[PDB]
Design a protein around this ligand. Sequence first.
Ligand SMILES: CCCCCCCCCCCC[N+](C)(C)[O-]
Length: 418
Amino acid sequence: AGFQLNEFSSSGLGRAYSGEGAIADDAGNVSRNPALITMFDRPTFSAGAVYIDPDVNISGTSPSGRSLKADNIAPTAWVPNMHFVAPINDQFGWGASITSNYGLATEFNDTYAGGSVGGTTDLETMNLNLSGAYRLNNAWSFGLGFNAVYARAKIERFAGDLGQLVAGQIMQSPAGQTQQGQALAATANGIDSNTKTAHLNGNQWGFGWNAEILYELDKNNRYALTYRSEVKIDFKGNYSSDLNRAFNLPIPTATGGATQSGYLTLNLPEMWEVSGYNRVDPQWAIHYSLAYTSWSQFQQLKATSTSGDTLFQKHEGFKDAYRIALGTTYYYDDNWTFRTGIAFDDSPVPAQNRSISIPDQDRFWLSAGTTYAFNKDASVDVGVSYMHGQSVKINEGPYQFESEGKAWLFGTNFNYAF
Ligand SMILES: CCCCCCCCCCCC[N+](C)(C)[O-]
Protein backbone atom coordinates (compact mmCIF):
# COMPACT_ATOMS: atom_id res chain seq x y z
CA ALA A 1 0.00 0.00 0.00
CA GLY A 2 1.42 3.37 -1.03
CA PHE A 3 0.33 5.90 1.58
CA GLN A 4 -2.42 3.69 2.97
CA LEU A 5 -2.78 2.80 6.67
CA ASN A 6 -4.47 -0.26 8.22
CA GLU A 7 -4.40 0.80 11.89
CA PHE A 8 -8.06 1.13 12.87
CA SER A 9 -7.98 -1.17 15.90
CA SER A 10 -5.51 -2.96 18.13
CA SER A 11 -7.42 -6.21 17.69
CA GLY A 12 -6.86 -6.03 13.96
CA LEU A 13 -3.16 -5.40 14.43
CA GLY A 14 -2.70 -8.59 16.40
CA ARG A 15 -4.51 -10.54 13.71
CA ALA A 16 -2.76 -8.71 10.84
CA TYR A 17 -6.03 -7.15 9.71
CA SER A 18 -7.15 -10.43 8.23
CA GLY A 19 -10.88 -10.73 7.59
CA GLU A 20 -11.71 -7.47 9.36
CA GLY A 21 -15.09 -7.22 7.67
CA ALA A 22 -16.26 -10.61 8.91
CA ILE A 23 -15.21 -10.36 12.55
CA ALA A 24 -16.88 -8.34 15.28
CA ASP A 25 -15.65 -9.22 18.71
CA ASP A 26 -15.09 -5.53 19.49
CA ALA A 27 -16.50 -2.24 18.21
CA GLY A 28 -13.45 -1.36 16.15
CA ASN A 29 -14.47 -3.33 13.08
CA VAL A 30 -17.63 -1.54 12.05
CA SER A 31 -15.53 1.55 11.29
CA ARG A 32 -14.55 0.25 7.85
CA ASN A 33 -17.29 -2.41 7.51
CA PRO A 34 -20.77 -0.92 8.39
CA ALA A 35 -22.83 -4.10 8.28
CA LEU A 36 -21.14 -5.57 11.33
CA ILE A 37 -23.37 -3.15 13.25
CA THR A 38 -26.09 -5.81 13.24
CA MET A 39 -23.74 -8.02 15.23
CA PHE A 40 -24.02 -5.81 18.34
CA ASP A 41 -26.98 -5.97 20.69
CA ARG A 42 -25.72 -3.21 22.97
CA PRO A 43 -23.82 0.10 23.07
CA THR A 44 -20.12 -0.71 22.53
CA PHE A 45 -16.96 1.42 22.86
CA SER A 46 -13.36 1.19 21.90
CA ALA A 47 -10.48 3.63 21.74
CA GLY A 48 -6.71 3.38 21.55
CA ALA A 49 -3.75 3.86 19.26
CA VAL A 50 -1.06 2.15 17.26
CA TYR A 51 2.53 3.30 17.51
CA ILE A 52 4.41 2.78 14.25
CA ASP A 53 8.19 2.53 14.31
CA PRO A 54 9.51 2.41 10.75
CA ASP A 55 13.10 1.92 9.66
CA VAL A 56 13.34 3.10 6.06
CA ASN A 57 16.67 3.64 4.34
CA ILE A 58 17.93 5.03 1.06
CA SER A 59 21.38 4.37 -0.37
CA GLY A 60 23.31 5.23 -3.51
CA THR A 61 25.75 7.71 -5.02
CA SER A 62 25.05 10.82 -7.10
CA PRO A 63 26.62 11.46 -10.51
CA SER A 64 28.40 14.22 -8.57
CA GLY A 65 30.16 11.56 -6.52
CA ARG A 66 28.23 12.67 -3.45
CA SER A 67 26.44 10.12 -1.28
CA LEU A 68 22.70 9.47 -1.62
CA LYS A 69 22.63 7.82 1.80
CA ALA A 70 19.31 8.64 3.39
CA ASP A 71 19.28 6.93 6.76
CA ASN A 72 16.01 6.38 8.68
CA ILE A 73 13.78 8.66 6.60
CA ALA A 74 10.45 7.52 8.08
CA PRO A 75 9.45 9.16 11.41
CA THR A 76 7.69 7.20 14.18
CA ALA A 77 3.94 7.72 14.38
CA TRP A 78 0.92 7.32 16.67
CA VAL A 79 -2.30 6.49 14.80
CA PRO A 80 -5.26 6.80 17.17
CA ASN A 81 -8.70 5.26 16.66
CA MET A 82 -12.02 5.69 18.45
CA HIS A 83 -15.28 3.76 18.00
CA PHE A 84 -18.90 3.74 19.07
CA VAL A 85 -21.60 1.34 17.96
CA ALA A 86 -25.18 1.21 19.22
CA PRO A 87 -28.42 -0.64 18.41
CA ILE A 88 -31.44 1.47 17.49
CA ASN A 89 -33.93 -1.41 17.44
CA ASP A 90 -33.82 -5.09 16.49
CA GLN A 91 -33.46 -4.28 12.79
CA PHE A 92 -31.31 -1.13 12.84
CA GLY A 93 -28.25 0.25 14.58
CA TRP A 94 -25.61 2.88 13.76
CA GLY A 95 -22.05 3.87 14.54
CA ALA A 96 -19.55 6.72 14.70
CA SER A 97 -15.78 6.71 14.62
CA ILE A 98 -12.52 8.54 14.10
CA THR A 99 -9.60 6.71 12.44
CA SER A 100 -6.89 7.23 9.85
CA ASN A 101 -6.87 5.32 6.58
CA TYR A 102 -4.07 7.30 4.86
CA GLY A 103 -0.83 8.92 5.90
CA LEU A 104 2.83 9.35 5.01
CA ALA A 105 5.92 11.15 6.23
CA THR A 106 9.34 11.08 4.62
CA GLU A 107 12.07 13.54 5.40
CA PHE A 108 15.67 13.91 4.19
CA ASN A 109 18.20 16.51 5.32
CA ASP A 110 17.87 19.69 3.28
CA THR A 111 21.56 19.34 2.47
CA TYR A 112 20.91 15.88 1.04
CA ALA A 113 22.31 15.58 -2.48
CA GLY A 114 18.88 14.32 -3.54
CA GLY A 115 17.08 17.45 -2.36
CA SER A 116 15.37 17.92 -5.73
CA VAL A 117 13.59 14.55 -5.45
CA GLY A 118 13.44 14.20 -1.69
CA GLY A 119 13.06 16.79 1.01
CA THR A 120 9.92 16.72 3.07
CA THR A 121 6.66 14.93 2.38
CA ASP A 122 3.83 14.76 4.88
CA LEU A 123 0.20 13.73 4.70
CA GLU A 124 -1.93 13.57 7.84
CA THR A 125 -5.41 12.10 7.44
CA MET A 126 -8.38 11.94 9.77
CA ASN A 127 -11.59 10.14 8.86
CA LEU A 128 -14.86 10.79 10.65
CA ASN A 129 -17.43 8.13 9.93
CA LEU A 130 -21.14 8.04 10.71
CA SER A 131 -22.73 4.75 9.73
CA GLY A 132 -26.01 2.91 9.94
CA ALA A 133 -27.13 -0.63 9.32
CA TYR A 134 -30.20 -2.70 8.62
CA ARG A 135 -30.71 -6.41 9.28
CA LEU A 136 -32.90 -8.04 6.62
CA ASN A 137 -33.01 -11.37 8.48
CA ASN A 138 -30.77 -13.91 10.25
CA ALA A 139 -28.46 -14.21 7.28
CA TRP A 140 -28.28 -10.83 5.58
CA SER A 141 -27.37 -7.38 6.84
CA PHE A 142 -26.78 -4.12 5.00
CA GLY A 143 -24.45 -1.32 5.93
CA LEU A 144 -24.19 2.26 4.67
CA GLY A 145 -21.71 4.89 5.84
CA PHE A 146 -20.67 8.46 5.09
CA ASN A 147 -17.13 9.72 5.58
CA ALA A 148 -15.62 13.11 6.20
CA VAL A 149 -11.89 13.10 5.42
CA TYR A 150 -9.59 15.90 6.58
CA ALA A 151 -6.09 16.09 5.13
CA ARG A 152 -3.14 18.33 5.93
CA ALA A 153 -0.07 17.90 3.74
CA LYS A 154 3.21 19.68 3.15
CA ILE A 155 5.72 19.13 0.35
CA GLU A 156 9.10 20.80 0.21
CA ARG A 157 11.97 20.01 -2.12
CA PHE A 158 15.47 21.40 -2.35
CA ALA A 159 18.45 21.09 -4.69
CA GLY A 160 21.03 18.52 -3.80
CA ASP A 161 23.84 18.87 -6.28
CA LEU A 162 21.67 19.66 -9.29
CA GLY A 163 23.49 22.99 -9.51
CA GLN A 164 26.84 21.21 -9.49
CA LEU A 165 25.53 18.62 -11.94
CA VAL A 166 24.03 21.06 -14.44
CA ALA A 167 27.04 23.32 -13.99
CA GLY A 168 29.26 20.32 -14.63
CA GLN A 169 27.31 19.60 -17.77
CA ILE A 170 27.58 23.21 -18.93
CA MET A 171 31.36 22.82 -18.59
CA GLN A 172 31.68 19.62 -20.60
CA SER A 173 29.86 20.61 -23.75
CA PRO A 174 31.35 22.83 -26.48
CA ALA A 175 29.67 25.90 -24.96
CA GLY A 176 32.03 25.40 -22.05
CA GLN A 177 34.81 27.85 -22.90
CA THR A 178 32.26 30.59 -23.65
CA GLN A 179 32.68 33.42 -21.13
CA GLN A 180 28.89 33.18 -21.24
CA GLY A 181 28.58 29.43 -20.72
CA GLN A 182 31.01 29.69 -17.81
CA ALA A 183 29.09 32.57 -16.19
CA LEU A 184 26.25 30.07 -16.46
CA ALA A 185 28.06 27.17 -14.76
CA ALA A 186 29.21 29.66 -12.12
CA THR A 187 25.62 30.56 -11.32
CA ALA A 188 24.24 27.04 -11.58
CA ASN A 189 27.08 25.62 -9.50
CA GLY A 190 26.31 28.49 -7.17
CA ILE A 191 23.01 27.18 -5.79
CA ASP A 192 23.38 25.67 -2.30
CA SER A 193 22.10 22.28 -1.14
CA ASN A 194 19.33 23.71 1.01
CA THR A 195 17.66 25.95 -1.53
CA LYS A 196 13.92 25.49 -1.37
CA THR A 197 13.17 24.29 -4.92
CA ALA A 198 9.46 24.01 -4.14
CA HIS A 199 6.91 24.43 -1.36
CA LEU A 200 3.32 23.19 -1.30
CA ASN A 201 1.03 22.87 1.73
CA GLY A 202 -2.67 23.00 2.52
CA ASN A 203 -5.68 21.44 4.23
CA GLN A 204 -8.99 20.30 2.79
CA TRP A 205 -11.95 17.97 3.20
CA GLY A 206 -13.14 15.16 0.97
CA PHE A 207 -16.26 13.00 1.29
CA GLY A 208 -17.04 9.38 0.54
CA TRP A 209 -19.33 6.51 1.52
CA ASN A 210 -19.34 2.78 2.39
CA ALA A 211 -21.50 -0.20 1.57
CA GLU A 212 -21.21 -3.72 2.92
CA ILE A 213 -23.25 -6.89 2.63
CA LEU A 214 -22.76 -9.31 5.48
CA TYR A 215 -23.87 -12.91 5.04
CA GLU A 216 -23.85 -15.39 7.88
CA LEU A 217 -24.36 -19.16 7.48
CA ASP A 218 -24.85 -19.12 11.24
CA LYS A 219 -23.70 -17.69 14.54
CA ASN A 220 -20.22 -19.10 13.86
CA ASN A 221 -19.76 -18.52 10.14
CA ARG A 222 -20.13 -15.48 7.90
CA TYR A 223 -18.56 -13.77 4.91
CA ALA A 224 -18.75 -10.24 3.60
CA LEU A 225 -18.17 -7.89 0.70
CA THR A 226 -17.51 -4.24 1.36
CA TYR A 227 -17.17 -1.21 -0.88
CA ARG A 228 -15.12 1.83 0.08
CA SER A 229 -15.65 4.74 -2.31
CA GLU A 230 -12.82 6.83 -3.71
CA VAL A 231 -12.33 10.24 -2.10
CA LYS A 232 -11.08 13.28 -3.98
CA ILE A 233 -9.56 16.19 -2.15
CA ASP A 234 -9.20 19.45 -3.99
CA PHE A 235 -6.52 21.28 -2.04
CA LYS A 236 -6.18 25.05 -2.17
CA GLY A 237 -2.88 25.89 -0.51
CA ASN A 238 0.32 27.92 -0.74
CA TYR A 239 2.96 27.42 -3.41
CA SER A 240 6.39 28.99 -3.89
CA SER A 241 10.00 28.43 -4.88
CA ASP A 242 13.07 30.21 -3.58
CA LEU A 243 14.81 29.93 -6.95
CA ASN A 244 15.06 33.30 -8.70
CA ARG A 245 11.99 34.08 -10.80
CA ALA A 246 14.50 34.01 -13.66
CA PHE A 247 15.18 30.23 -13.72
CA ASN A 248 11.75 30.02 -15.33
CA LEU A 249 14.19 23.35 -17.64
CA PRO A 250 12.22 20.57 -15.90
CA ILE A 251 12.22 22.60 -12.68
CA PRO A 252 9.25 23.79 -10.54
CA THR A 253 8.06 27.34 -11.33
CA ALA A 254 10.33 29.80 -9.49
CA THR A 255 8.72 32.60 -7.49
CA GLY A 256 11.76 34.28 -6.00
CA GLY A 257 10.39 33.03 -2.70
CA ALA A 258 7.03 34.74 -3.10
CA THR A 259 3.95 32.72 -2.18
CA GLN A 260 0.85 32.36 -4.35
CA SER A 261 -2.35 30.32 -4.22
CA GLY A 262 -1.92 26.75 -5.41
CA TYR A 263 -4.40 24.04 -6.34
CA LEU A 264 -3.95 20.27 -6.22
CA THR A 265 -6.29 17.28 -6.36
CA LEU A 266 -5.33 14.29 -4.22
CA ASN A 267 -7.03 11.05 -5.15
CA LEU A 268 -7.52 8.56 -2.33
CA PRO A 269 -8.13 5.11 -3.93
CA GLU A 270 -11.44 3.32 -3.53
CA MET A 271 -11.29 -0.10 -2.01
CA TRP A 272 -13.02 -3.43 -2.38
CA GLU A 273 -12.66 -6.19 0.22
CA VAL A 274 -14.06 -9.70 0.51
CA SER A 275 -13.56 -11.55 3.77
CA GLY A 276 -14.64 -14.50 5.85
CA TYR A 277 -14.69 -15.67 9.45
CA ASN A 278 -14.93 -19.29 10.63
CA ARG A 279 -15.44 -20.25 14.28
CA VAL A 280 -14.30 -23.78 13.48
CA ASP A 281 -14.42 -24.77 17.16
CA PRO A 282 -15.78 -23.35 20.42
CA GLN A 283 -12.27 -21.98 20.97
CA TRP A 284 -10.81 -21.42 17.51
CA ALA A 285 -11.69 -19.07 14.68
CA ILE A 286 -9.96 -18.70 11.37
CA HIS A 287 -10.19 -15.32 9.52
CA TYR A 288 -8.97 -14.29 6.08
CA SER A 289 -9.44 -11.57 3.46
CA LEU A 290 -8.39 -10.28 0.04
CA ALA A 291 -8.49 -6.54 -0.60
CA TYR A 292 -8.45 -4.76 -3.91
CA THR A 293 -7.38 -1.12 -3.93
CA SER A 294 -7.57 0.75 -7.19
CA TRP A 295 -4.41 2.83 -6.92
CA SER A 296 -5.01 3.47 -10.61
CA GLN A 297 -7.04 6.45 -9.47
CA PHE A 298 -3.83 8.03 -8.19
CA GLN A 299 -2.25 8.94 -11.50
CA GLN A 300 -0.34 12.06 -10.47
CA LEU A 301 0.33 14.98 -8.19
CA LYS A 302 -0.23 18.23 -10.11
CA ALA A 303 -0.26 21.77 -8.69
CA THR A 304 -2.09 24.58 -10.51
CA SER A 305 -1.92 28.38 -10.11
CA THR A 306 -5.09 30.46 -10.00
CA SER A 307 -4.34 31.37 -13.62
CA GLY A 308 -4.33 27.65 -14.37
CA ASP A 309 -0.62 27.10 -15.05
CA THR A 310 1.42 24.21 -13.66
CA LEU A 311 3.66 25.21 -10.73
CA PHE A 312 4.63 21.68 -9.68
CA GLN A 313 4.07 18.22 -11.13
CA LYS A 314 5.04 14.63 -10.42
CA HIS A 315 3.87 11.60 -12.37
CA GLU A 316 2.91 8.67 -10.17
CA GLY A 317 1.18 6.16 -12.43
CA PHE A 318 0.02 3.68 -9.80
CA LYS A 319 -1.67 0.38 -10.64
CA ASP A 320 -4.38 -1.35 -8.62
CA ALA A 321 -2.98 -3.72 -5.98
CA TYR A 322 -4.04 -6.52 -3.60
CA ARG A 323 -3.53 -7.24 0.08
CA ILE A 324 -3.88 -10.79 1.33
CA ALA A 325 -4.35 -11.76 4.99
CA LEU A 326 -4.79 -14.94 7.05
CA GLY A 327 -4.98 -15.19 10.83
CA THR A 328 -6.50 -17.07 13.73
CA THR A 329 -8.02 -16.28 17.10
CA TYR A 330 -7.82 -18.48 20.19
CA TYR A 331 -10.71 -17.89 22.61
CA TYR A 332 -8.89 -19.43 25.58
CA ASP A 333 -11.06 -18.71 28.60
CA ASP A 334 -13.53 -16.02 29.73
CA ASN A 335 -10.51 -13.87 30.49
CA TRP A 336 -7.98 -14.54 27.78
CA THR A 337 -8.07 -14.37 24.02
CA PHE A 338 -5.05 -14.75 21.74
CA ARG A 339 -4.48 -13.96 18.06
CA THR A 340 -1.92 -14.30 15.27
CA GLY A 341 -1.84 -13.15 11.69
CA ILE A 342 0.30 -13.21 8.61
CA ALA A 343 -0.24 -10.95 5.62
CA PHE A 344 1.15 -9.75 2.31
CA ASP A 345 0.20 -6.55 0.44
CA ASP A 346 2.00 -5.63 -2.73
CA SER A 347 2.95 -2.08 -3.55
CA PRO A 348 0.95 -0.43 -6.39
CA VAL A 349 4.00 1.41 -7.69
CA PRO A 350 5.64 0.10 -10.91
CA ALA A 351 9.44 -0.07 -10.65
CA GLN A 352 9.52 2.52 -13.44
CA ASN A 353 7.55 4.99 -11.33
CA ARG A 354 9.19 4.49 -7.91
CA SER A 355 10.43 7.67 -6.21
CA ILE A 356 12.21 8.35 -2.90
CA SER A 357 9.24 10.37 -1.55
CA ILE A 358 7.15 7.22 -1.14
CA PRO A 359 9.84 4.62 -0.43
CA ASP A 360 7.22 1.94 -0.97
CA GLN A 361 7.56 -1.77 -1.64
CA ASP A 362 5.85 -5.16 -1.29
CA ARG A 363 5.25 -5.95 2.38
CA PHE A 364 5.15 -8.94 4.70
CA TRP A 365 3.18 -8.78 7.95
CA LEU A 366 3.59 -11.18 10.85
CA SER A 367 1.62 -10.45 13.98
CA ALA A 368 0.44 -11.53 17.40
CA GLY A 369 -1.96 -10.21 19.95
CA THR A 370 -3.79 -11.01 23.14
CA THR A 371 -6.94 -9.76 24.84
CA TYR A 372 -7.67 -9.63 28.53
CA ALA A 373 -11.32 -9.28 29.45
CA PHE A 374 -12.05 -7.89 32.91
CA ASN A 375 -15.75 -8.82 33.05
CA LYS A 376 -17.51 -9.08 29.68
CA ASP A 377 -18.06 -5.31 29.74
CA ALA A 378 -14.48 -4.11 29.79
CA SER A 379 -11.40 -5.43 28.02
CA VAL A 380 -7.99 -4.33 26.82
CA ASP A 381 -6.40 -5.20 23.47
CA VAL A 382 -2.63 -5.39 23.10
CA GLY A 383 -1.25 -6.10 19.68
CA VAL A 384 2.12 -6.24 17.99
CA SER A 385 3.08 -6.66 14.34
CA TYR A 386 6.34 -6.99 12.41
CA MET A 387 6.62 -5.53 8.94
CA HIS A 388 9.33 -6.18 6.41
CA GLY A 389 9.53 -4.84 2.89
CA GLN A 390 11.08 -5.89 -0.38
CA SER A 391 14.26 -4.02 -1.21
CA VAL A 392 13.94 -2.22 -4.53
CA LYS A 393 15.80 0.01 -6.99
CA ILE A 394 14.73 3.60 -7.75
CA ASN A 395 15.49 5.72 -10.81
CA GLU A 396 14.45 9.30 -10.21
CA GLY A 397 15.90 12.23 -12.12
CA PRO A 398 19.66 11.77 -12.76
CA TYR A 399 20.04 9.76 -9.59
CA GLN A 400 19.79 6.07 -8.82
CA PHE A 401 19.01 4.95 -5.28
CA GLU A 402 18.16 1.75 -3.47
CA SER A 403 15.83 1.49 -0.48
CA GLU A 404 14.79 -1.13 2.07
CA GLY A 405 12.23 -0.94 4.85
CA LYS A 406 11.09 -2.75 7.97
CA ALA A 407 8.79 -1.56 10.76
CA TRP A 408 7.40 -2.59 14.14
CA LEU A 409 3.89 -1.81 15.40
CA PHE A 410 2.60 -1.85 18.98
CA GLY A 411 -1.01 -1.01 19.77
CA THR A 412 -3.34 -0.80 22.74
CA ASN A 413 -7.07 -0.41 22.84
CA PHE A 414 -9.56 -0.29 25.69
CA ASN A 415 -13.05 -1.66 25.18
CA TYR A 416 -16.25 -1.02 27.04
CA ALA A 417 -19.95 -1.72 26.81
CA PHE A 418 -23.20 -1.39 28.76
C1 LIG B 1 -1.05 23.33 -2.98
C2 LIG B 1 -0.63 22.29 -1.94
C3 LIG B 1 -1.22 20.93 -2.31
C4 LIG B 1 -0.74 19.95 -1.23
C5 LIG B 1 0.17 18.90 -1.84
C6 LIG B 1 0.04 17.70 -0.87
C7 LIG B 1 0.27 16.35 -1.57
C8 LIG B 1 0.12 15.20 -0.53
C9 LIG B 1 0.36 13.92 -1.30
C10 LIG B 1 1.06 12.85 -0.48
C11 LIG B 1 1.62 11.74 -1.43
C12 LIG B 1 3.19 11.68 -1.31
N1 LIG B 1 4.06 11.50 -2.56
C13 LIG B 1 3.37 11.17 -3.75
C14 LIG B 1 4.52 12.87 -2.81
O1 LIG B 1 5.07 10.79 -2.38
